[PDB]
Design a protein around this ligand. Sequence first.
Ligand code: CLA
Ligand code: CLA
Ligand code: CLA
Ligand code: CLA
Ligand code: CLA
Ligand SMILES: CC1=C(/C=C/C(C)=C/C=C/C(C)=C/C=C/C=C(C)/C=C/C=C(C)/C=C/C2=C(C)CCCC2(C)C)C(C)(C)CCC1
Ligand SMILES: CC1=C(C/C=C(\C)CCC[C@H](C)CCC[C@H](C)CCCC(C)C)C(=O)c2ccccc2C1=O
Ligand code: SF4
Lengths: 41, 80, 64, 73, 165, 143, 740, 73
Amino acid sequence: MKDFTTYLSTAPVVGLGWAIFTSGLLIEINRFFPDPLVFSF
Amino acid sequence: AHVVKIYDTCIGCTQCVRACPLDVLEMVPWDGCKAAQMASSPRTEDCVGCKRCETACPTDFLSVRVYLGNESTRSLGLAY
Amino acid sequence: EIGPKRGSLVKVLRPESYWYNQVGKVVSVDQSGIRYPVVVRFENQNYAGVSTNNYALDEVTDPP
Amino acid sequence: QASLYTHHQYIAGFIMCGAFAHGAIFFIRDYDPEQNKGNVLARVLDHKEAIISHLSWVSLFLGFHTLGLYVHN
Amino acid sequence: DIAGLTPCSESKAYNKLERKELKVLDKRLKKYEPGSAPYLALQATKERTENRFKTYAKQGLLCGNDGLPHLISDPGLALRFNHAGEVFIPTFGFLYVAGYIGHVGRQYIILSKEDAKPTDKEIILDVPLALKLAFQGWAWPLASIQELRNGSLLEKDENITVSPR
Amino acid sequence: PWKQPELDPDTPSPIFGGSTGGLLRKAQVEEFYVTTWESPKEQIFEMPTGGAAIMRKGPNLLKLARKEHCLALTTQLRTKFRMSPCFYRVYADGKVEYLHPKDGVYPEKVNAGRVGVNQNMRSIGKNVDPIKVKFTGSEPFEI
Amino acid sequence: KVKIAVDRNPVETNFEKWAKPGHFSRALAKGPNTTTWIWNLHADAHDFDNHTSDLEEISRKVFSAHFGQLGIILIWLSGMYFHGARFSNYEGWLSDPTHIKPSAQVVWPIVGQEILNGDVGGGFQGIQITSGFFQLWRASGITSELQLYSTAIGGLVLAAACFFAGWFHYHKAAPKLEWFQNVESMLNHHLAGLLGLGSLAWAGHQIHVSLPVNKLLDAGVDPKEIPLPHEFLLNQSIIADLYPSFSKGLAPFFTLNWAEYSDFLTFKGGLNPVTGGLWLSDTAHHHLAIAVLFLVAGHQYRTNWGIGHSIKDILESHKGPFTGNGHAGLYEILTTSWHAQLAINLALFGSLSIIVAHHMYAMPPYPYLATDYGTQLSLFTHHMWIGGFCVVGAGAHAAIFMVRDYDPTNNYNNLLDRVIRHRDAIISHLNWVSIFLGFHSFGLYIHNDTMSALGRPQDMFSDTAIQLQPVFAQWIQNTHFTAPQLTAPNALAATSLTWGGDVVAVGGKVAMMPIALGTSDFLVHHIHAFTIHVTVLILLKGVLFARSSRLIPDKANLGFRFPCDGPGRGGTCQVSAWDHVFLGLFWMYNSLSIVIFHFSWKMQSDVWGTVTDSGVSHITGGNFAQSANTINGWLRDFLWAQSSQVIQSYGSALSAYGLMFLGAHFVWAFSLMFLFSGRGYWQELIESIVWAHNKLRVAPSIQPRALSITQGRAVGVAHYLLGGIATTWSFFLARIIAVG
Amino acid sequence: GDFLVHHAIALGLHTTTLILVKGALDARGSKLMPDKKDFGYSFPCDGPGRGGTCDISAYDAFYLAVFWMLNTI
Ligand code: CLA
Ligand code: CLA
Ligand code: CLA
Ligand code: CLA
Ligand code: CLA
Ligand SMILES: CC1=C(/C=C/C(C)=C/C=C/C(C)=C/C=C/C=C(C)/C=C/C=C(C)/C=C/C2=C(C)CCCC2(C)C)C(C)(C)CCC1
Ligand SMILES: CC1=C(C/C=C(\C)CCC[C@H](C)CCC[C@H](C)CCCC(C)C)C(=O)c2ccccc2C1=O
Ligand code: SF4
């Protein structure tokens, strides 16, 4: 597991994990909530 | 032709003369370095300015400097 | 003997050098009386690719 | 009016580029730091990296955000 | 009603744009049976359109001579009039996250530099320290201010590579 | 070297076919270069301006329109076979010049017999600004 | 002699080399000191020549690389089949191909994308596709989505099998170098085995499966009650009524009575009028004859049983006096250099892809494909560009072989050495014909533009004015039209409707109609010849001068991909063969862009259109004979007369094509930074940014460096090509979807 | 839209100013090449050494800045 998780920790996988996390977060915000323009609570 | 100058920062790895395929550079004895060698340019009129000696120079900044200008039939690399 | 201690961290004040105002490690200091006897090794390469260079006595002081 | 505006604007811009190029020519050809040591010119040359970096920052920031809203709209 | 912009609730061009969008959206509705899945998707799109037009109105938003809502950028004018939600609060909203990324990048750079061969740490990330710093960056401006006063944030230029001009 | 060698007109040349890359009208009008070496056996080399040519057991002769071709062939021979050849220059009037080491033991060595030329005892970057040498005809690096 | 030499377990299966990203290269095995280490890592990733000097390990590496690419392509094909199975209107399109546009990509309703789910008909919404998969799934008889699901799952299974095969054939059981050097066995097995077996299997599938399904499809029978192909396969009674020769039951095949098979192995020229594609019986006899031709050609070489041909003997025996040694050593080069075989295979693959595009635009081999103008245009343009890319890569890898794997020992007076010898003559004559073609094509265009601008249309090079009639092409057209009359009397009609006399039409739209060639076609064809001659000049000069040159005699020792040899000799920038390929990519781009512009304009102005009772009306006003002679006519009547739907695509189903168009404009324009500029300015700017990050202590441990000169050129050409390709793709697809 | 195009104009002026100012300040010296004053104002490059020195002169900075000037006007 150590030998594989060392590869898992390199930049291309980090280039996915942050990308998947932030992308999916923005998809769920734009999905459950409609498209707004004003931050009036 | 071009002007090739060698400064006192040279310490003599005798590799700048191998990277030059024009026999411009030569190595003279010296006393300012451990290797007791210093680059010299006797046939500086036969240089084209390809800067391969600059690629081969390991000192920072470079001991050998090649300055362009005043081009001729031999420094332009024409066989015609 | 005439230069800094071997292995000590030093600062280079050579203007035209890539390692101006940087910290390097002394690897050897020549005692034969040459132009640039203080030879130092740096952790970061230059644009050419080398990591070591030689400097004079006046270009090497201890960093604060 | 349109031709006059566009002509004099392009003339002004080319003259701007020439002004900056000839200022660079001044900086390389005839500039003595020993003659003017510690003055405004030497001090501007002293922190030139800060000036270039801040110009790069404001250019990057303007381009990033302006293209962001243009693509968004 | 600043800069000659009517509110979106009392704008004729805003309602004409809404009627035009409802007309073209209902144009595609006549080509499908009401019990179909494209009909449900078109109905949900129309509901999202109506909800967006309703929520964009009655929120202080204004528009002028186009039917498209406008944003007020000047602070104070967006504070005396109810327009701080357009750009004033998103300004601090972005800056908090922007300072979050800059702070955790700085702490990771500082932590990795005090380690043997630190160039490998940039291409070989470590997860537990990066994730710990990721969840320890909520108070980024509080860490940024204290480092600013004491010199740990900045660095004097005697150990900074400077141009040889 | 110990004595400067003069090339022999009698020496043979390697067998080769017709190559478009070769001597031009600059050989007639201006100078051209001639390379000589002595071979132990028949080996195959590649000319810097053409294809492949089988060389002759013994002395050999190559004519190159440029000195760079001559030193490229020299480096190829020295790397591939430890050959150590030498080249010359033949002018339009028949004058012969020796450019490959006049000391004879190559620029890689020193031989304690050549004088340092175009060498500055100052460091690089210690040169004066062009304003200090303006309207003088001398460059800062030429001082 | 030929055997299976395999080494078992040469490489352990572990993530040890996955842990350290830089392991293939000893220069990259130290560490990432500079930011150019990453680009060198992703650049030398698959360059197996400098990883090791052993040819056996390189052969194993490329074998499993091809296995991985095959698995990737199988995954992609399985995904396409799954998309057609799940998110598609294939069932609706089968019952109405002339009124329902194909669609196989369904977007999410997440952010405004519901407008992209266009009303393609059949109670379905989605992205209107252009690959023509529905036409292929109608040719190869496919009725329901269950069959597409089964095909997708089988493709996924075969992709997993291919990936496991790559893992096995590298890590577990790696073949030796003698296994890869069995060229005769390779050629026999990939001629008789691969090509011949696939052609025979496809002919059998067409005869037993596709022929009855396509016979029932164009007869008006709904696909719901069409019998499944296994019923046709097992039961001779059902297949006997559609084709009476099946009642004989393989009797005429062994009794040499093949004339009885003239019902479903027909020899007919033209297209099926009901569907617009080629007759499936003609394709069945075609693939059967191709299988015959590849079965007989796959038993030519000698491998283990004495009889056959030895390729070394064939090469060494063909020697002609103006060539000296004739093909003397080429067997030794092609059995030891991967790059030479890569160049040959890529060149032939690219040229054959060009033939594929031309012969699909000429004869549509799929039902309801000719009337689907978008699928035809997309197929032609796509295979056009893929063929061009393969040809440019062939030139690149030929130059790589020249730099690396070429040695002067084996070749003395052979063809390759003599091509090296007279390379200056070849380059000079190619330059002469380049200048000649460029002048009397483009100067003709400029002269026509000038005479139009000077108000003298009678002095132009047009049909109304003095003309350059393409007599040879028109004579070939007339010969091919009259070919079934005399030279091929057994053909029902002409092999294509390019030169015919009749117009076929399905659903009220023109499927394929005769094509007239005039002065404008002459001008564009000689423009194409000029452009291809220039591109081949650039590639051939880069290949020939990669080893040595009159400028740089030691270019061989400087490697293949190097930026320059310095500013010497006036500046030897872009002197490497890699930069020759870098320029040839742009010249390819210009060539294929003008070619597909000619294709789109000619087919929209003289082929594509809607048939009426009062004559045939095309998509345009038939202005190709009047506007393609001038540059301004080309511009106004092709790039401005069209693209009016791309700009007004907003708010509609094809607005994503307008977005893609403008993003392609962005990327095409963004490339010119990496093309015009250099590195020293960018390096100094990076130094200033490094100082800025140093001031407040966010200095990265890895030193930020500017991109390399070769790296910058690669980024520039990649962004330029991607932008141009996507620009033409968006414009072509939007124009052909909103109109056709 | 007038505001957006004004800020795009400001971006163009800012980027042109950035490149021209950087070329003027780096006209005599830089970390990649301190001795730029010895090579004249308009020189091609220094060679492929030190990673590559293409377009290192202040003349090259002007030449790259003319494109941005043309785009801005
Ligand atoms: C229209 C084409 C085009 C575009 C868009 C740019 C854009 C840029 N150039 Mg420029 N340039 C161009 C043509 C262009 N150039 C040409 C033809 C030349 C003549 C050679 C130059 C010469 C030139 C010089 C000399 C300099 C620039 C600089 C710049 C930057 C200015 C900073 C800025 O505006 O903020 C950013 C502007 C943007 C447009 C943002 C682009 C990035 C967006 C967000 C997309 C990013 C990718 C996206 C997130 C998707 C990710 C995946 C994807 C990567 C696959 C910017 C990156 C300056 C620079 O880099 O210094 C800081 C600089 O010194 N350029
Ligand atoms: C987190 C690390 C970090 C930090 C604190 C900074 C800080 C700075 N940079 Mg730098 N930058 C970074 C990373 C970073 N940069 C990276 C990775 C790149 C390469 C894309 C750049 C490229 C860059 C340029 C080209 C310029 C700056 C400039 C600046 C200054 C303006 C502030 C700003 O937003 O710039 C804008 C920064 C960007 C547009 C880069 C965005 C890239 C992402 C956001 C960084 C990702 C880092 C990562 C998430 C950290 C790892 C987290 C850890 C837990 C593992 C400031 C000193 C400007 C300057 O000189 O101002 C004086 C300038 O011209 N930077
Ligand atoms: C008649 C036997 C036969 C057949 C059918 C093939 C078929 C193929 N070979 Mg070839 N090959 C053969 C004998 C055969 N080989 C022999 C005898 C040798 C030794 C001289 C080689 C050495 C060889 C090399 C060195 C390479 C190939 C490659 C390929 C593939 C090229 C990809 C392509 O064109 O798309 C066609 C693609 C398909 C048809 C996809 C389906 C692929 C199926 C699963 C393969 C089934 C065929 C196989 C022979 C069945 C027996 C294998 C068994 C152990 C499971 C193709 C699948 C390339 C490769 O690596 O790909 C594997 C390659 O570079 N061949
Ligand atoms: C039969 C196919 C084939 C094969 C087996 C090879 C194999 C090889 N080639 Mg060749 N090549 C091919 C086709 C092929 N090539 C074609 C078609 C071209 C023309 C474009 C080239 C052009 C070419 C050049 C110019 C060079 C090679 C080199 C190489 C070697 C290493 C390649 C590498 O590591 O890439 C690494 C992989 C990458 C860098 C990834 C590719 C990313 C590209 C640049 C962008 C792709 C974008 C994509 C299309 C769309 C995405 C959009 C984006 C927004 C996400 C290797 C011997 C190099 C070498 O040194 O040879 C020994 C070399 O200099 N080849
Ligand atoms: C459309 C843009 C364009 C044009 C017209 C040219 C033109 C040229 N390039 Mg170039 N090229 C370009 C972009 C372009 N380039 C770009 C962007 C690149 C980078 C990838 C290249 C890469 C490249 C390479 C790699 C090569 C060329 C070559 C050529 C020449 C081909 C000459 C020929 O056969 O045509 C005929 C001539 C023309 C089309 C020029 C215009 C002639 C008009 C019609 C005027 C006719 C005569 C006129 C009346 C005389 C005026 C008299 C007046 C002075 C009074 C020519 C000088 C090749 C070369 O050197 O020639 C073999 C070559 O090898 N180019
Ligand atoms: C009265 C008035 C006002 C005010 C105004 C003002 C205050 C203005 C200003 C203005 C300004 C303030 C401007 C400026 C400009 C500038 C510029 C445009 C510059 C340029 C520069 C350059 C080009 C440089 C060059 C050089 C170099 C590069 C280096 C060295 C040398 C030299 C210097 C030459 C107001 C608005 C309130 C209102 C109305 C009225
Ligand atoms: C611009 C430019 C550079 C500078 C470009 C560099 C250093 C490359 C920058 C690559 C970036 C860092 C890749 C990643 C881009 C973004 C950070 C991605 C953003 C993604 C979002 C989701 C945040 C050169 O180095 C160069 C070299 C030779 C010829 C021309 C040029 C040239 O034109
Ligand atoms: S500009 Fe660049 S490619 Fe050209 S000779 Fe100089 S360093 Fe080489």
